[PDB]
Amino acid sequence: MGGPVEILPFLYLGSAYHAARRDMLDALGITALLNVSSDCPNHFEGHYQYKCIPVEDNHKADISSWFMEAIEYIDAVKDCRGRVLVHSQAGISRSATICLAYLMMKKRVRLEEAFEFVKQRRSIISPNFSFMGQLLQFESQVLA
Amino acid sequence: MGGPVEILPFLYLGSAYHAARRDMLDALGITALLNVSSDCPNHFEGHYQYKCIPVEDNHKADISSWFMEAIEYIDAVKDCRGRVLVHSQAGISRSATICLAYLMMKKRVRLEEAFEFVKQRRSIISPNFSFMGQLLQFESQVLA
Amino acid sequence: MGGPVEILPFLYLGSAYHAARRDMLDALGITALLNVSSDCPNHFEGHYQYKCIPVEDNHKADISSWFMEAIEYIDAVKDCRGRVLVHSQAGISRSATICLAYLMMKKRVRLEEAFEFVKQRRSIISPNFSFMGQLLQFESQVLA
Amino acid sequence: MGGPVEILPFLYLGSAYHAARRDMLDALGITALLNVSSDCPNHFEGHYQYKCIPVEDNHKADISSWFMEAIEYIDAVKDCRGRVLVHSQAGISRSATICLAYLMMKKRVRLEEAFEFVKQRRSIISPNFSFMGQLLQFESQVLA
Amino acid sequence: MGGPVEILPFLYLGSAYHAARRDMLDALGITALLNVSSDCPNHFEGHYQYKCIPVEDNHKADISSWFMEAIEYIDAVKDCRGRVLVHSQAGISRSATICLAYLMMKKRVRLEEAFEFVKQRRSIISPNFSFMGQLLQFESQVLA
Amino acid sequence: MGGPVEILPFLYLGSAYHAARRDMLDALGITALLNVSSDCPNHFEGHYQYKCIPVEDNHKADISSWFMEAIEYIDAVKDCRGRVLVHSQAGISRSATICLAYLMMKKRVRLEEAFEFVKQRRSIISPNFSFMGQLLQFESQVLA
Amino acid sequence: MGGPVEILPFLYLGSAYHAARRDMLDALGITALLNVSSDCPNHFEGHYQYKCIPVEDNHKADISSWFMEAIEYIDAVKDCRGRVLVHSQAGISRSATICLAYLMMKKRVRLEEAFEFVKQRRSIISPNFSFMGQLLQFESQVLA
Amino acid sequence: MGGPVEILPFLYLGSAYHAARRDMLDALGITALLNVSSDCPNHFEGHYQYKCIPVEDNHKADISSWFMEAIEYIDAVKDCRGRVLVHSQAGISRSATICLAYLMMKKRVRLEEAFEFVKQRRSIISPNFSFMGQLLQFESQVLA
Amino acid sequence: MGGPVEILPFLYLGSAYHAARRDMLDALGITALLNVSSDCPNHFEGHYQYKCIPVEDNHKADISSWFMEAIEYIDAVKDCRGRVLVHSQAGISRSATICLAYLMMKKRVRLEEAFEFVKQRRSIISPNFSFMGQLLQFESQVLA
Amino acid sequence: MGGPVEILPFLYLGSAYHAARRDMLDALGITALLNVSSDCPNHFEGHYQYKCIPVEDNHKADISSWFMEAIEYIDAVKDCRGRVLVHSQAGISRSATICLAYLMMKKRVRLEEAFEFVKQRRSIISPNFSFMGQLLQFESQVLA
Amino acid sequence: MGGPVEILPFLYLGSAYHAARRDMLDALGITALLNVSSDCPNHFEGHYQYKCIPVEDNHKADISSWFMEAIEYIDAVKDCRGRVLVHSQAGISRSATICLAYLMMKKRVRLEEAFEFVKQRRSIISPNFSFMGQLLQFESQVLA
Amino acid sequence: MGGPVEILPFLYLGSAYHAARRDMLDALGITALLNVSSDCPNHFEGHYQYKCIPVEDNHKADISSWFMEAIEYIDAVKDCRGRVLVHSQAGISRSATICLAYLMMKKRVRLEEAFEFVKQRRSIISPNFSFMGQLLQFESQVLA
Amino acid sequence: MGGPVEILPFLYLGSAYHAARRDMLDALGITALLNVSSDCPNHFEGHYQYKCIPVEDNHKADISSWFMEAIEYIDAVKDCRGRVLVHSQAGISRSATICLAYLMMKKRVRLEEAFEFVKQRRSIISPNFSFMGQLLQFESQVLA
Amino acid sequence: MGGPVEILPFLYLGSAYHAARRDMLDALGITALLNVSSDCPNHFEGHYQYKCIPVEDNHKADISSWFMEAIEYIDAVKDCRGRVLVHSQAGISRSATICLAYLMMKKRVRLEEAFEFVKQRRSIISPNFSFMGQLLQFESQVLA
């Protein structure tokens, strides 16, 4: 817990624990949620916009494929002047990988630079190696 | 958090966090809620009376227009011998501006005096400047 | 808060705050709830048995009339081998008065003795004077 | 409270208090719940898989009969690569007995060894004597 | 002990212990004493004005009857510009009930308000329930 | 000093020092006094009931003879719903022996049991050996 | 309390509390008492010489008139080689005024000087203004 | 104060303050009192045996004359197996001188030895010089 | 020093030390000064309004005469919406007497009540007796 | 006091207390002073440049009118490479309002931004509401 | 600094630092000043009486000559019931010498005695040797 | 502040703050002042000798030119056996440079040696570089 | 070690360590010993009564069979008014099981109740599961 | 434990615990032991002289009969210049009674005096009442 960290004015990073907290969500004015796990429920289907990205914290997980879909979604909520809560079970690997991919893309930066910019927000960050490589593979592409 | 502050026996001021807490709401015997934000959900639509006042914590926000509608609503719940929870995301600007407008009106007082009477209740109070001016514009009118 | 106090194995006393806490309710195995207030909602209508006793913490409140209906209800849940949570806003006056009335009746005792037996459970107990007199009026009757 | 203990990667032990906490459930990625009590509600019927095993923390409780049904259920959720939360009111007797029965069976071990393996996880463990005997009766059988 | 509390400039509340202390009596300038017990002696019959009100700290005690006689006596000593020491064995129930009855009457106030005004003076105050009811019965009458 | 200990609601044990203290006597509501010494004066002959039992804290003292007379007296004051203060110089031997004899008799118990019941009240208790033997001699008789 | 202060070998100043204390009186060897109040009793009429000077701690009190009578009395007890205890309720105003008047007279000194000589004895001294003026009026006269 | 010191089982030394304390007197079991002052009253004439020895704490005091009368009195109370409280205003000079004279006589010892034996009991002892000389004059005689 | 105390929004009480402090004067916005001494200079004749009331801290001082002139002056500065600093050498007797007289008059109150109202402001207050009497003489008149 | 705060190298904000301190003025090298009060004197007319802006800390004060005159003056002293001390009685409202108006103008910024920039310098800042509104009215204009 | 010491009710000793402090001067009620230096200015020529005694803290200084003139001046201010502040640069040598000469003369005492009487007031005292001798020379003469 | 440092018996170094302090000036017996700034006023034109040396704490300041004029002035006051206070705004650069130049000249020493001799007096010393170079240029010349 | 715990006046529970301590045995007055292990020697065969019950702390141990023999033995020593020390190697499992069986039987109680009654005596108690079941099997029988 | 106390050079008092300690026995050079209990073994029959006195710590114990036999035994070991250890289970009642009887006899003293002489040795001493009486009965006889 502790509360979701504001990566960008419209982009927040958090735990699945946070996703189940309406008080926490509304206190931050979150309007949408990006469930970057595969089974975390979307309890408040009626009041918040939900987008799911069914991934496992694996090496056997191809989280890179969804980068675009996710980025889109985020940009989407960004344009409605809303606030998305990208989140996964612990908010360490998955939800982070994605916030990184988005930052690398939108703001065009090194996985390095991004990784830092975010470590400062939620020091717990730690994309498992597999994702790390995929985050690189994607990196080259974004810069091209 | 911390809990909503009782401005008037029938008037309370709080956070959107509080609005999502049934235990907190019933412990104070709140019967109605005045959502002074633009996207905070009304989760318990079925058990509490809700009134929305779609405003942003902007300078580009014309919160003054709703003063009357809001005051009415509050007076309304006041007459049912209920308890309203005027609230906005953080419970610092918006929800405050309104409680002020109401007090100035109903009890006829200087934005000054009111502002104080409330600072003593929720020291966090801080209507952004724009609202501050609008609270003055309205002030003259209430005294007339 | 703090949690509801177990007056009797099947009789608990608490706050309206507690009534809104499923985790707290199930942790104590409460099966029914006796809302001794007039507007506290019954959020979980579907999972717990609810009985309402619409009273105000007034001197202008005739809480004595419901004593029988309430006692019945409690005995009812008692027979299903359940657990009732008699409760009012703060769990100081109303919900207490009733637990007292019940104890005086069922176990036949002095308002005095009862009042004590309960002060030891939830030291916060404090039936407003009006109720206090009504608790006496009822006392004589129970002993007859 | 405190949070449910992970007995097995897919097997967790907890309180009924935990069962009412979505944030806690999703933070651990629990997908199913095994209510080893007789009246604890299943509030989130829609989002989590629920299985009930109606038992009392009695000596007059034949919890042994359900061992197989329960083990099955657990194995079931195990195969979906999910996570079950076996739980009872306090998470001391009932929910424990069952986790024990399962461990004895699946991993074939002495009630002794198991009891320990679990005491280390949730030191509060304490199957009432009746269950203890039934856990033994079942033990012989599992080893055969 | 500790010393008698000054309820009113001419009205003090205390213990029977105090009644036996000349030094304490003269130090406060007490001129009269109202023995609200049934057997406490009046040792200094010669130097202080004594008035007895033979009551027990019972439920079987009709202390209400004497309210008028007592109030009179108190008003009497009040007019001689003296100082009365209303007192009972412990100075918790009896002597208090009476000071309350007097205050309610003379100053016309709610048993509630009075009870408080006095709790602040001698926090030990505690009219047994019976008296409490009688104090109410009398209340209505005083307001009429 | 310190104050007399309440053995029974109507039976107290104390020092001769206490016997000379009106404030102390009335604060406890003592109505009668049983002087279990041979020369301690009865200063307040006029306000308290006095009964003398002229004994020495000797081995050459036949305190047993008076047991009956004393018990009577005590029962007497007991019936008037009063309070006796059995006392001797220090309140260690004599006044104790007697409270014991009375307890053994009235409530029928072992000198042992009584002795304890009282040690817990006034830990200073210590009937000189002679009395101790006489308390036994009397014990057999009371049980017969 | 605390004990009476020795102004002069034969002149002491004190409280009415002291006047009620034989132990204190004899410990100081007081033989006479000068009651400078209007209602404080003279409990030990038989053993100590008493002289009364019926005054109020008023502005409406002409304590000056008695100065001579009092001084006389004091000189009287002085000649019997006794010890007088001049005293009033609190021993702050009245009994002080008089000790001052006496000192001014007998030893011929400024109200100023005396006032001091005594403040050093009983720092609590404080003749109400009225008396203060009367103490001056008398001062001129004594010096003449 | 502090309490009278036991010089001999039947001989105690004290202050006039003590003489006025019944509680203290009876607590020690004093039966007689020897007032070695000239004006200290004998308040409890009815309950204690009193003997007066009218002396001043002077150099102009012939306390020696009474030595015999006093010793007699003391021996007297000694024979009734009682307890005398020899005492003077402060219990420093007079009452001491006498206890000394008695000791010197009865037990035949040097004023020196006695003086010590007693200093150890009431360190405050201090017979004014005059008495000191008279105590010597008497000393020679007792040894003869 | 310490700074002048604000008795009334337009009335301050202080020391002659303060009168010599421009920084202090302007920080409080004092516009006028009432020198209630007889020789304290008026250094800043050019920038502040000065009014002198040549009195001594005597008994031989008829400060009462000026009460009216002073009150006037104060009312004067009061009307210009200014701030007067009534002051004397130490700011204990003289400058106080006057603030009292003014309060008694303007707000019509007992020398008693006023004296207090001011003690709470500058606890050092202490009009010498003479002034005290004159403050009374004047009191009667103001109430008439 | 404490000393004036340096808003700009040539612009300082302070109390009227400071204005009366030459040592403080010269220590900071202040050459001019802008008296934003209505009656604070200009004691050192001969050595420092003074400019007055006669305003009250009112809601009835039109401080806005002088904004231009004041800004001019400040720019003036700015050009002589001097240092102005804008100041009012307490240095909270008036003198602040003006420093704000100047900053908004000269450096073109939001009342918001300025208000902050200054709060960091003299945390005590607090333009009464009226001025606040006037500061806004002026804001729009400056940006145009 | 620290403040000038009051040698005599009308005679004070101090530093030149003090002479420049009006607040300090008026707080003590100094009316005249005796500048015992040769160049210290008399800043407040208009409000205080000044007398100069042009001396150096030398051995080559004939301060004795002025003794008479100075004493006169002091006596002068003494008669107007004023207060003189004799002072020199540091208030150690010069101003002291003079206060001494005055004391020796007026009160007729040994340079020794005086020197002490003053050391106790301003421990810093230290007339340079030359002055010391001159103070003696003068001593003989004063005694004659 | 803190006070000016005595460089030479007739030469002191200080702040402009000091220059505004008469008490400080006279306490040190300063007779003349050398204002080494360009705008610090000379408030007490009438009582102290003033000499101005209009310089800026610049690099663009030719403070060297005035060295001779200044030295002269200083020597001048030196001959009148007076005391000069060389001073600039902070008393760090300007006023120091000059005291150095003077020392170098008068006592003929290395800028080095002087700089030290003075650092020990006012550790704050710090002639800006420009002055430092000019202090060297002048050094060679003084040694020639 | 630590010493054997007194379960019953004639029944103690302990370690094999204790069995080897004569001092400990005689200090407790143990007369007999019940060796509930299989190889612990009976060193003092000559002085204490020994009874062996050859069991292992196994699951493969049929300790139940001996329950009767053991109970008999214990009752035996009980009748000789002796004291048995039931004990096993560590005094945790075996010796406990037996004390339990005995208590259940003799005093007829639930394995539950007994287990507790003993846990309070030797908190270390812990019959291995096997024994636990056997203790239940036996339980039913004892109640029949 | 702690070790046996040396009552007499040849007489020691102790616990049965001590009796089992050879190291303790030889360290004190005990040669004989007097077992004043009824079942404590005599483990070292071969090395120490043992004498048994079969008594219970009862009231129903006639320990007096053995007094002579015991005393004899003790005198016996005394003559061999040995050392006896009189002892009972705890060494509080029995073994003490006997050491007392012996002392009373051999050294002829009051049970009182002896009791003390020994309390100082082993403060734990406490002959049960029965023995106490028997110790008295025997006392008279020894003195005869």
Exposure class string for G69-95: b at 16+ Cβ within 10 A, else e? ebbebbeebbeeebbbbbbbbbbbbbb
> Residue F6: enclosing H or E segment and its boundaries?
strand F5-8
Per-window interface: N 62-81 vs F, CB < 8 A: none
DSSP H11: E
Sign of the CA dihedral L91, L93, L97, L103? positive
Residue in G18, G41, G89 nearest the CB of E47: G41
CA–CA gap between residue F126 and residue I118 (Å, rounded): 64
The residue whose two tokens read 């985050």 is A135
The range of the structural domain enclosing residue B80 comes to 1-144
Which residues of D fall within a CB distance of 8 Å from C23? 1, 16-21
Neighbours of I69 (CB within 10 A): 12
Tell me the helix, strand and coil percentages in chain G, rounded to 5: 40, 15, 40
Sheet of M5-8, strands arranged across: M5-8, M11-15, M84-88, M32-35, M49-52
Q: Distance, in angstroms, between M49 CA and closest chain N CA?
A: 11
CA–CA gap between residue L86 and residue L121 (Å, rounded): 14
Strand pairing partners for C87? C14, C35
CB N134, CB F136: distance < 8 Å: no
DSSP B126: -
Q: 3-state DSSP call for residue G125?
A: coil
Contacts of F123 (CB under 8 A, 6+ apart): none
CA–CA gap between residue H38 and residue H94 (Å, rounded): 11
Nearest CA to C53 out of C62, C140, C45, C44 is that of C62
CA–CA gap between residue B59 and residue B61 (Å, rounded): 5
Nearest CA to G85 out of G54, G120, G51 is that of G51
> Residue F142: enclosing H or E segment and its boundaries?
helix F129-143
CA–CA gap between residue J139 and residue K14 (Å, rounded): 57
CB E94, CB C93: distance < 8 Å: no
- Domains: count for chain I: 1
The residue whose two tokens read 């005159």 is J69
Whether C22 has its CB under 8 Å from any CB of chain D: the answer is yes
CA–CA gap between residue J93 and residue J95 (Å, rounded): 6
CA–CA gap between residue L7 and residue L106 (Å, rounded): 13
CB N32, CB N85: distance < 8 Å: yes
Q: Distance, in angstroms, between K109 CA and closest chain L CA?
A: 31
Residue in K23, K25, K46 nearest the CB of I21: K23
CA–CA gap between residue L95 and residue L93 (Å, rounded): 6
Q: Distance, in angstroms, between G17 CA and closest chain H CA?
A: 16
Q: How far is CA N138 from CA N11, N62, N65, N133, N142, in A?
A: 20, 12, 10, 9, 6
Whether K90 has its CB under 8 Å from any CB of chain L: the answer is yes
Q: Phi, psi at residue M140, to the nearest 5°?
A: -45, -55
CB L93, CB L126: distance < 8 Å: yes
Contact F17 H23 (CB under 8 A): yes
CA–CA gap between residue B121 and residue B103 (Å, rounded): 14
Which residues of C fall within a CB distance of 8 Å from E112? 128-129
End-to-end CA distance of chain D: 38
CB F101, CB F135: distance < 8 Å: yes
Q: 3-state DSSP call for residue N24?
A: helix
Q: 3-state DSSP call for residue H65?
A: coil
Residue in H17, H39, H41 nearest the CB of G27: H17
Residue in I27, I47, I82 nearest the CB of J41: I47
Nearest CA to E6 out of E119, E121, E112, E124 is that of E121
Interface test with G, best of E12, E26, E77 (most G CBs within 10 A): E26
- Asked if chain D contacts chain C via 3 or more Cβ pairs within 8 Å, the reply is yes
CA–CA gap between residue G93 and residue G97 (Å, rounded): 6
| CA angle at A51 for the pair A49 and A54, rounded to the nearest 5° | 155
Q: 3-state DSSP call for residue H82?
A: coil
Q: Distance, in angstroms, between A10 CA and closest chain B CA?
A: 14
CA–CA gap between residue J100 and residue J121 (Å, rounded): 12
DSSP F51: E
Which residues of L fall within a CB distance of 8 Å from J27? 1, 15-17, 20, 89-90
How, if at all, do strands M5-8 and M11-15 pair?
antiparallel
Strand pairing partners for H85? H12, H33
CB H21, CB H4: distance < 8 Å: no
Helix boundaries (H) for chain E: 16-19, 22-27, 67-79, 94-107, 111-119, 129-143
Exposure class string for H4-26: b at 16+ Cβ within 10 A, else e? bbebbebbbbbbbbbbbbbbbbb
Which residues of D fall within a CB distance of 8 Å from M132? 129, 132-133, 136
CA–CA gap between residue M105 and residue F47 (Å, rounded): 61
Exposure class string for N17-29: b at 16+ Cβ within 10 A, else e? bbbbbeebbeebe
Q: Phi, psi at residue E90, to the nearest 5°?
A: -100, -15
CB K139, CB K25: distance < 8 Å: no
Q: At what angle do helices A94-107 and A67-79 cross, to 10 degrees?
A: 70
The residue whose two tokens read 């100035």 is B104
Contacts of I54 (CB under 8 A, 6+ apart): I37, I38
CATH number, domain of I140, equals: 3.90.190.10
Q: 3-state DSSP call for residue G56?
A: coil
Neighbours of K57 (CB within 10 A): 23
CA–CA gap between residue J48 and residue J32 (Å, rounded): 5
CA–CA gap between residue B39 and residue B53 (Å, rounded): 10
CA–CA gap between residue I135 and residue I111 (Å, rounded): 7
How, if at all, do strands I84-88 and J5-8 pair?
unpaired
- Mapped to the 3 state alphabet, what secondary structure does M63-82 carry? CCCCHHHHHHHHHHHHHCCC
CB C72, CB C56: distance < 8 Å: no
Using only C-alpha atoms, chain H has a radius of gyration, in whole angstroms, of: 14
Q: Which residue of J has its CA nearest to I83?
A: J39
Q: How far is CA J56 from CA A127, H29, J111, in A?
A: 63, 84, 21
Which residues of B fall within a CB distance of 8 Å from C40? 26, 29
Nearest CA to D31 out of D94, D68, D73, D63 is that of D73
The residue whose two tokens read 């009872």 is D88
Contact M59 D112 (CB under 8 A): yes
Neighbours of J56 (CB within 10 A): 18
Which residues of D fall within a CB distance of 8 Å from A39? 29, 31, 82
CA–CA gap between residue N112 and residue N104 (Å, rounded): 9
Q: How far is CA H70 from CA E144, H85, H115, H134, in A?
A: 75, 12, 18, 15
Contact H21 G23 (CB under 8 A): yes
Q: Distance, in angstroms, between J2 CA and closest chain L CA?
A: 13
CB L59, CB L128: distance < 8 Å: yes
Retrieve residue C28's tokens: 């104590």
* Cα–chain center distance at K105: 13
Using only C-alpha atoms, chain J has a radius of gyration, in whole angstroms, of: 14
Whether E21 has its CB under 8 Å from any CB of chain F: the answer is yes
Residue in C110, C115, C133 nearest the CB of E136: C133
Neighbours of K45 (CB within 10 A): 10
Q: 3-state DSSP call for residue H49?
A: strand
Whether A45 has its CB under 8 Å from any CB of chain B: the answer is no
CA–CA gap between residue K107 and residue K97 (Å, rounded): 15
Nearest CA to K18 out of K44, K55, K38 is that of K44
Can you point out the beta strands (E) in A1-121?
A: 5-8, 11-15, 32-35, 49-52, 84-88
Q: How far is CA F66 from CA F6, F16, F30, F72, F134, in A?
A: 22, 19, 22, 10, 11
- Asked if chain K contacts chain A via 3 or more Cβ pairs within 8 Å, the reply is no
Q: Phi, psi at residue D89, to the nearest 5°?
A: -30, -65
CB L28, CB L4: distance < 8 Å: yes
Q: Which residue of L has its CA nearest to K90?
A: L27
Residue in B21, B26, B44 nearest the CB of C40: B26
CA–CA gap between residue G95 and residue G101 (Å, rounded): 10
Helix boundaries (H) for chain J: 16-19, 22-27, 67-79, 94-107, 111-119, 129-143
CB I87, CB I4: distance < 8 Å: yes
Q: Which residue of D has its CA nearest to A45?
A: D47
Helix boundaries (H) for L16-143: 16-19, 22-27, 67-79, 94-107, 111-119, 129-143
Which residues of N fall within a CB distance of 8 Å from M31? 39
Q: How many CA atoms lie within 13 A of D75 on its CB side?
A: 12
Q: Distance, in angstroms, between G106 CA and closest chain H CA?
A: 26
